[PDB]
Ligand binder design. Structure first.
Ligand SMILES: Cc1cc2nc3c(=O)[nH]c(=O)nc-3n(C[C@H](O)[C@H](O)[C@H](O)COP(=O)(O)OP(=O)(O)OC[C@H]3O[C@@H](n4cnc5c(N)ncnc54)[C@H](O)[C@@H]3O)c2cc1C
Ligand SMILES: O=c1nc2n(C[C@H](O)[C@H](O)[C@H](O)CO)c3cc(O)ccc3cc-2c(=O)[nH]1
Length: 463
């Protein structure tokens, strides 16, 4: 059914719904992993199709709202998809396009297109679970899930929530020999569909990407400060970004990754978030590069351990966007400090506009507003001050999530929920010295940042 093959480890795929395979095509419902290369979900779909002697097709369902995403994210995504249509067409793989709630739309497409098998990629977010539940209730064919985003499938890396990077790391590293491997080439279709009410991705893109942008987003926020030229979308551009990282930035990454005045990060996160490039691919190429061992170890721990522990966090904590997901020590500490007098209480709107008393905080928010990607070091500072200057930890978490999800190109992502939870709630951290308001949550002061990098320069750049 799912045939054996070179580099096709069956542990990457599991049945969401087992059943009777139909005579029709294999449909890959693409959602998280928007690429044609290095995509285990697409590769498995193609293998299932080959075994059944049917075509494989791809379908995508555009929702007009997604976790507070606006025009900046939808346009980045849709420009990517425009390129993807060409790549898929070159492999003779049809791509179809739906609009609305994927729950309803995907199950109806499965009926209308007479799919014999359904496959999707893996996301641990609540919204994907909700769509999947609805689809299952509406189909009568087998439905598989493939982890295309993680090197080690999320449900294999650990059977539970990992409290620390140091408990996850040995589990993950022990499984790299099995799962850190090259990808096979995607075989083009050899079987022709020749196949109403179904529009192709090509069809819907004939009048451009702008026509597809959600109306509700534009109306809610014109997004005047966004600068679209910092990150070009799509698989080709992602590859360029990875190659320039390796060539120009990787050697200095270990020394300078915590300095937000230096452009020494990979800049891969928007591409990784939309699955326009594979983290497994990135790891393979970094492993091959001759660079500083310190920098390689640091980079690999981020894209392997911290990225995959974020999927672990969301997968094993259904309330990952809530205070109750925090470790017990942190809930106890924040609870004990709930009635401490705050020095500042900012509204969502004040934080959003960068209108605090702290110019480093404001500059961090301006980097986010202007570029859609805040430096990783200042993201920690930024979220921690939202805790410090909100009425409650719950309110802080709500605000941090909202701004991250509204404005980061790489947001609405397990890495964001996990990073915000680390920052505000000590998830995957330890307790530090007790303070008013913030209790034992790790503190990051303005003066501490001044000691570590040129704060004045960062502020000037985003003024
Ligand atoms: C408050 C807060 C919010 C965050 N929100 C997001 C988010 O919405 N989306 C997002 O992808 N990351 C988020 N992160 C994690 C991290 O800051 C970003 O992944 C990183 O800054 C992206 O830039 P880069 O790809 O140039 O990073 P690089 O340092 O080059 O890292 C390469 C890749 O490794 C992964 N990675 C790196 N650092 C982390 C980390 N700390 N946790 C998890 N994975 C990591 C990412 O996939 C990243 O793209 C957040 C962190 C914090 C503290
Ligand atoms: O399948 C979809 N995935 C969309 N995604 C992808 C999202 O990463 C996945 O839907 C989740 O991983 C759950 O599968 C978006 C991601 C963003 O950051 C912003 C907007 C979207 C919109 C959609 C969408 O309309 N349909």
């Amino acid at each position: 059914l799912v045939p054996r093959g070179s580099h096709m480890n069956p542990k990457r795929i599991r049945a969401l719904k087992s059943g009777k395979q139909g005579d029709g095509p294999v449909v890959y419902w693409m959602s998280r992993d928007q690429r044609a290369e290095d995509n285990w979900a697409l590769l498995f779909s193609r293998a299932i199709a080959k075994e059944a002697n049917v075509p494989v097709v791809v379908v995508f369902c555009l929702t007009d709202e997604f976790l507070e995403a606006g025009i900046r994210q939808y346009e980045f995504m849709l420009k990517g998809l425009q390129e993807l249509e060409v790549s898929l067409s070159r492999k003779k793989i049809p791509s179809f396009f739906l609009r609305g709630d994927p729950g309803e739309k995907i199950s109806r497409f499965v009926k209308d297109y007479n799919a014999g098998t359904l496959v999707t990629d893996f996301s641990p977010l609540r919204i994907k679970n909700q769509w999947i539940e609805k689809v299952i209730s509406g189909i009568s064919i087998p439905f598989f899930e493939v982890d295309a985003h993680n090197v080690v499938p999320c449900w294999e890396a650990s059977q539970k929530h990992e409290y620390a990077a140091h408990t996850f790391r040995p589990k993950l590293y022990a499984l790299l020999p099995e799962f850190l491997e090259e990808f096979p080439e995607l075989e083009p279709n050899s079987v022709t569909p020749e196949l109403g009410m179904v529009e192709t991705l090509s069809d819907v893109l004939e009048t451009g990407v702008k026509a597809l942008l959600p109306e509700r987003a534009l109306l809610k926020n014109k997004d005047p400060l966004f600068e679209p030229w910092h990150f070009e979308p799509g698989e080709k551009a992602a590859k360029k970004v990875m190659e320039s990282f390796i060539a120009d930035r990787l050697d200095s990454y270990g020394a300078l990754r915590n300095d937000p005045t230096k452009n020494m990060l990979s800049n891969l996160s928007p591409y990784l978030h939309f699955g326009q490039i594979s983290s497994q691919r990135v790891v393979l190429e970094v492993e091959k590069a001759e660079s500083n061992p310190g920098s390689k170890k640091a980079f690999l721990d981020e894209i392997l351990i911290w990225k995959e522990i974020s999927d672990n966090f969301c997968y094993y904590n259904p309330g990952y966007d809530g205070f109750e997901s925090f470790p017990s020590w942190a809930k106890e500490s924040l609870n004990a400090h709930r009635n401490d007098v705050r020095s500042h209480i900012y509204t969502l709107e004040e934080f959003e506009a960068g209108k605090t008393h702290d110019p480093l905080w404001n500059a961090s928010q301006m980097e986010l507003l202007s570029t859609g990607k805040m430096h990783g070091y200042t993201r920690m500072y930024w979220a921690k001050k939202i805790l410090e200057w909100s009425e409650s930890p719950e309110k802080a978490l709500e605000i941090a999530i909202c701004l991250n999800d509204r404005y980061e190109l790489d947001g609405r992502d397990p890495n964001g929920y996990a990073g915000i939870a680390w920052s505000i709630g000590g998830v995957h951290d330890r307790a530090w010295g007790e303070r008013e308001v913030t209790g034992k949550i790790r503190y990051m002061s303005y003066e501490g940042c001044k000691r570590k990098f040129d704060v004045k320069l960062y502020i000037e750049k985003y003024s």
